[PDB]
Design a protein around this ligand. Sequence first.
Ligand SMILES: CC(C)(COP(=O)(O)OP(=O)(O)OC[C@H]1O[C@@H](n2cnc3c(N)ncnc32)[C@H](O)[C@@H]1OP(=O)(O)O)[C@@H](O)C(=O)NCCC(=O)NCCS
Ligand SMILES: CC(=O)NCCc1ccccc1
Ligand SMILES: CC(=O)NCCc1ccccc1
Length: 210
Amino acid sequence: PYTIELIQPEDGEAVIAMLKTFFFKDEPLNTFLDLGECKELEKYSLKPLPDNCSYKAVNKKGEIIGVFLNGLMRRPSPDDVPEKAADSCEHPKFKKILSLMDHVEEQFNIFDVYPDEELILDGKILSVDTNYRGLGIAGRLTERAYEYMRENGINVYHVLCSSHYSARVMEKLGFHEVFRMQFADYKPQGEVVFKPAAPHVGIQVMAKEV
Ligand SMILES: CC(C)(COP(=O)(O)OP(=O)(O)OC[C@H]1O[C@@H](n2cnc3c(N)ncnc32)[C@H](O)[C@@H]1OP(=O)(O)O)[C@@H](O)C(=O)NCCC(=O)NCCS
Ligand SMILES: CC(=O)NCCc1ccccc1
Ligand SMILES: CC(=O)NCCc1ccccc1
């Protein structure tokens, strides 16, 4: 038995504690790099919370057993000055992840796919406690966001997935691929950076129109 609830500002520490236990250790890129202590990822994860559209799954004892942290994303302004997230990161391992994210954004802009949309929901951090996996919690977290989208006239939910394994979960939930890149083809300075196990394959950006 569990609830799905809006994450409140006072939940920040508990959210970080849960992420440090699971996501920091078990998301494929993080574990491949052996991310370790990473205050930059803590900072990254707390950022979307004040957008008031991030959800926690909470067990019968009041413990957080899953989160989906989402933020609003806006179409770049006509006078936009694009910035690389990796530039302001001092943690070398997390910088590799941010650099990959920057590369994806350089190759693919979700707003090109949906010219009429000004605001899109961005699913940033998805994590479920191991002992509660395979129960559909990811789906119920995702579904709660549909409520927010309806309430705010948002049509598109965009989720960058770091493995084919998690992309498949999003497919089950009704998302489709909009961009992909194999790890074997990601060679920003001429050489492969990420070489996780073969089944991960690469990143897939997933989208659903709700
Ligand atoms: C991705 C993740 C959030 C999925 O959460 P979830 O609530 O377990 O999702 P689901 O219940 O839909 O299970 C997904 C699949 O995991 C598999 N699974 C089944 N039991 C499982 C278990 N005990 N443990 C792990 N995986 C299990 C199944 O293939 C299942 O699919 P199916 O139920 O449709 O057959 C979770 O695996 C996770 O936290 N992974 C590590 C962090 C990560 O990679 N996050 C996503 C980054 S994009
Ligand atoms: C939806 C989701 O959880 N994407 C994960 C991207 C990612 C972010 C930070 C470190 C590693 C990987
Ligand atoms: C079009 C398709 O077959 N996509 C799934 C395989 C895949 C390819 C690249 C990165 C991640 C995953």
